Write an enzyme that holds these catalytic residues in place. Structure first.
Site, mmCIF file in Angstrom:
data_model
loop_
_atom_site.group_PDB
_atom_site.id
_atom_site.type_symbol
_atom_site.label_atom_id
_atom_site.label_comp_id
_atom_site.label_asym_id
_atom_site.label_seq_id
_atom_site.Cartn_x
_atom_site.Cartn_y
_atom_site.Cartn_z
ATOM 1 N N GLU A 135 65.130 7.062 53.531
ATOM 2 C CA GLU A 135 65.705 6.192 54.589
ATOM 3 C C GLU A 135 64.781 5.013 54.896
ATOM 4 O O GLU A 135 65.228 3.897 55.266
ATOM 5 C CB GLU A 135 65.950 7.047 55.864
ATOM 6 C CG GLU A 135 66.936 8.173 55.630
ATOM 7 C CD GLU A 135 68.350 7.658 55.325
ATOM 8 O OE1 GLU A 135 68.691 6.526 55.623
ATOM 9 O OE2 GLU A 135 69.152 8.391 54.756
ATOM 10 N N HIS B 114 71.464 2.094 47.781
ATOM 11 C CA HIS B 114 71.687 3.170 46.831
ATOM 12 C C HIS B 114 72.053 2.565 45.494
ATOM 13 O O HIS B 114 72.763 1.538 45.443
ATOM 14 C CB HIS B 114 72.796 4.094 47.315
ATOM 15 C CG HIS B 114 72.518 4.730 48.655
ATOM 16 N ND1 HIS B 114 73.468 4.880 49.596
ATOM 17 C CD2 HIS B 114 71.345 5.258 49.194
ATOM 18 C CE1 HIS B 114 72.935 5.473 50.681
ATOM 19 N NE2 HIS B 114 71.635 5.704 50.433
ATOM 20 N N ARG C 34 43.971 2.815 45.016
ATOM 21 C CA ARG C 34 43.437 3.609 43.906
ATOM 22 C C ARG C 34 42.819 2.743 42.778
ATOM 23 O O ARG C 34 42.947 3.058 41.581
ATOM 24 C CB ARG C 34 44.480 4.594 43.409
ATOM 25 C CG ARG C 34 44.662 5.673 44.497
ATOM 26 C CD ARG C 34 45.672 6.719 44.137
ATOM 27 N NE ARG C 34 47.046 6.172 43.992
ATOM 28 C CZ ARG C 34 47.973 6.082 44.967
ATOM 29 N NH1 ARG C 34 47.705 6.429 46.231
ATOM 30 N NH2 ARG C 34 49.206 5.649 44.679
ATOM 31 N N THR D 161 48.063 0.676 33.927
ATOM 32 C CA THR D 161 47.364 1.266 32.803
ATOM 33 C C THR D 161 46.532 2.482 33.159
ATOM 34 O O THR D 161 45.484 2.378 33.855
ATOM 35 C CB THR D 161 46.460 0.258 32.057
ATOM 36 O OG1 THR D 161 47.221 -0.917 31.835
ATOM 37 C CG2 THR D 161 46.033 0.875 30.655
ATOM 38 N N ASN E 43 42.025 5.233 24.803
ATOM 39 C CA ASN E 43 42.311 6.405 25.583
ATOM 40 C C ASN E 43 41.360 7.478 25.267
ATOM 41 O O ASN E 43 40.926 7.592 24.124
ATOM 42 C CB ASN E 43 43.723 6.935 25.282
ATOM 43 C CG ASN E 43 44.759 5.839 25.422
ATOM 44 O OD1 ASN E 43 45.239 5.371 24.422
ATOM 45 N ND2 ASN E 43 44.974 5.319 26.667
ATOM 46 N N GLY F 126 45.426 25.935 22.932
ATOM 47 C CA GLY F 126 46.665 25.777 22.202
ATOM 48 C C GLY F 126 46.581 24.735 21.077
ATOM 49 O O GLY F 126 45.557 24.009 20.880
ATOM 50 N N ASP G 104 47.640 21.408 19.654
ATOM 51 C CA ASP G 104 48.095 20.161 20.195
ATOM 52 C C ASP G 104 48.340 19.059 19.179
ATOM 53 O O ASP G 104 47.760 19.066 18.095
ATOM 54 C CB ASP G 104 47.102 19.704 21.252
ATOM 55 C CG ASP G 104 46.851 20.789 22.305
ATOM 56 O OD1 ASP G 104 47.826 21.086 23.062
ATOM 57 O OD2 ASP G 104 45.724 21.301 22.436
ATOM 58 N N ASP H 291 41.963 -1.025 5.200
ATOM 59 C CA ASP H 291 42.599 -1.622 6.349
ATOM 60 C C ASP H 291 42.776 -0.644 7.517
ATOM 61 O O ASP H 291 43.349 -1.015 8.579
ATOM 62 C CB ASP H 291 43.910 -2.354 5.989
ATOM 63 C CG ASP H 291 44.910 -1.475 5.267
ATOM 64 O OD1 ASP H 291 44.762 -0.240 5.312
ATOM 65 O OD2 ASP H 291 45.848 -2.031 4.620
HETATM 66 CA CA LIG Z 1 42.578 3.924 39.651
HETATM 67 CA CA LIG Z 2 44.011 22.335 21.134
HETATM 68 CA CA LIG Z 3 45.240 4.012 22.567
HETATM 69 CA CA LIG Z 4 43.447 2.111 34.783
HETATM 70 CA CA LIG Z 5 46.869 22.217 24.945
#
Ligand SMILES: [Ca+2]
Ligand SMILES: [Ca+2]
Ligand SMILES: [Ca+2]
Ligand SMILES: [Ca+2]
Ligand SMILES: [Ca+2]
Ligand SMILES: [Ca+2]
Ligand SMILES: [Ca+2]
Ligand SMILES: [Ca+2]
Length: 456
Positions: free
Chosen positions: A168, A177, A243, A317, A337, A344, A346, A440
């Protein structure tokens, strides 16, 4: 063809694609289209004092406002302490994402605007209602409490009382909406009108295939979801101060919001990450179910046993992701990253940039889609590679044409050289996909890599 591990990352990367196709027979809207739909009235607050934010005051009314009695709303009552506490958490979650601020107090000269919160008892009014900022009752929102409907008495993170407040307040800020809309999802204008995309929808996420609960009710996002974030930032600007240092979401959270914090293997998370800067992590290490985590801005992940429940806002990001003890997919973005698969088996996809990839225990697979994923000037490092256990999968690049292992490039497409540098315990795989006679493509490993560790 490609391997299954590539197919899985490809399909998951595309599973929640929007735009240019039909969803439940309806047009599929991108985030931007849905953000314009949510803002189609063009109503907004104005920065009347030029201070750069929309600065609103709000009152929890303690008695019926003038005009109240002729409105057919039944018995007025004021918010309880719990309703007030929850209302302020909902207000905080809108202020986190956009340049709007809220300060409790009566209407005053320096305000851009004023809001009010109160309860009514006549069921005819629906569960709640609110007005947009271009109306004569701008700022007002109203919440049903009576003998038949107690949801609003007990708002709490994850429940319908809490989302109703966030919803609301969304109206008071200028949100509609998703559609004009007795009314059902069948009346929706676009396929993504559900509570997986916007707290402004009424329709169960089950319409669009997400799984939050066994029934398709009552687990609910407490804070603005992906399309809401974009809609409100379109009106007021993005709050980039939020943040803006390094932030962890999930387990071990430093985000300091109840809806971003997981503490138990059984927690149900439903959130869209807004984050203003810094080196940030999605830490999902506390769950045991199979997860699929996507670090692309605007994308969805299946977290903690649920599906389509976590997303990252446009324009954000997030750098790192940690899986749990289940068999996970972790997909990176264009940035460097850190991806950590945990226990497990992955499947990790770094994507663009030099990534550092950890499989953790189990048999892990590191997946490559484009040569540009790992090039000599920006190479991934497979930080815990286990030869004879883990796999480097290149099949999305080679389409199963294979590689020719050689000691140095010969000018043939698909020539590859695997080396081990004893001096630094560093494996390397260099590949000349084009066939020009120079690598490459380059991945470095911690530990050795062997030809039988490579899928191509
Ligand atoms: Ca942050
Ligand atoms: Ca793993
Ligand atoms: Ca990456
Ligand atoms: Ca970031
Ligand atoms: Ca995992
Ligand atoms: Ca202002
Ligand atoms: Ca491993
Ligand atoms: Ca990469």
């Amino acid at each position: 063809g490609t391997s299954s591990a590539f197919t899985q990352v490809d399909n998951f990367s595309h599973f929640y694609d929007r735009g240019n196709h039909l969803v439940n027979g309806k047009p599929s809207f991108t985030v931007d289209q849905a953000a314009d739909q949510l803002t189609r009235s063009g109503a907004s607050w104005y920065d009347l004092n030029g201070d750069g934010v929309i600065n609103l005051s709000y009152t929890f009314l303690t008695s019926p406002p003038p005009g109240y009695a002729s409105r057919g709303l039944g018995t007025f009552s004021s918010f309880s302490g719990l309703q007030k506490e929850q209302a302020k958490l909902s207000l905080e979650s809108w202020a986190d994402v956009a340049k709007v601020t809220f300060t409790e107090g009566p209407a005053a000269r320096g305000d851009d605007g004023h809001m009010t919160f109160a309860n009514f008892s006549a069921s005819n009014g629906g569960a709640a209602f609110a007005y947009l900022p271009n109306s004569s009752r701008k700022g007002e929102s109203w919440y049903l409490i009576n003998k038949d409907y107690d949801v609003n008495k007990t708002p709490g993170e994850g429940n319908y009382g809490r989302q109703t407040l966030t919803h609301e307040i969304g109206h008071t800020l200028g949100l509609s909406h998703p559609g004009d809309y007795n009314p059902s999802y069948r009346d929706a204008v676009y396929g993504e009108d559900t509570r997986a995309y916007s707290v402004m929808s009424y329709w169960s996420e089950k319409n669009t295939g997400q799984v939050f609960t066994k029934t398709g009710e009552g687990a609910y996002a407490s804070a603005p979801l992906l399309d809401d974030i974009a809609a409100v930032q379109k009106l007021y600007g993005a709050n980039m101060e939020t943040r803006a240092g390094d932030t962890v979401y999930g387990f071990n959270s430093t985000a300091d919001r109840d809806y971003y914090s997981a503490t138990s293997a059984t927690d149900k998370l439903i959130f869209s990450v807004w984050d203003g800067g810094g080196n940030d992590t999605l830490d999902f290490s506390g769950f045991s179910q199979n997860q699929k985590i996507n670090l692309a801005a605007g994308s969805f992940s299946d977290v903690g046993g649920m599906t389509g429940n976590v997303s990252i806002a446009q324009g954000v990001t997030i750098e790192n992701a940690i899986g749990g003890s289940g068999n996970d997919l972790l997909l990176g973005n264009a940035a460097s990253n850190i991806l950590k698969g945990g226990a497990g088996n992955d499947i990790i996809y770094g994507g663009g940039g030099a990534d550092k990839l950890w499989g953790g225990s189990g048999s892990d697979t590191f997946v490559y889609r484009e040569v540009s994923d790992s090039t000599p000037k920006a190479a991934d490092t497979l930080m815990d590679f286990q030869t004879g256990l883990d796999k480097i999968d290149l099949t999305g690049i080679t389409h199963l044409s294979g590689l020719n292992f050689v000691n140095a490039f010969t000018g043939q497409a698909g020539d590859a050289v695997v080396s081990y540098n004893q001096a630094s315990n560093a494996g390397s795989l260099q590949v000349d996909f084009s066939g020009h006679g120079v690598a490459d493509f380059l991945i470095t490993t911690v530990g050795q890599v062997a030809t039988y560790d490579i899928v191509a």
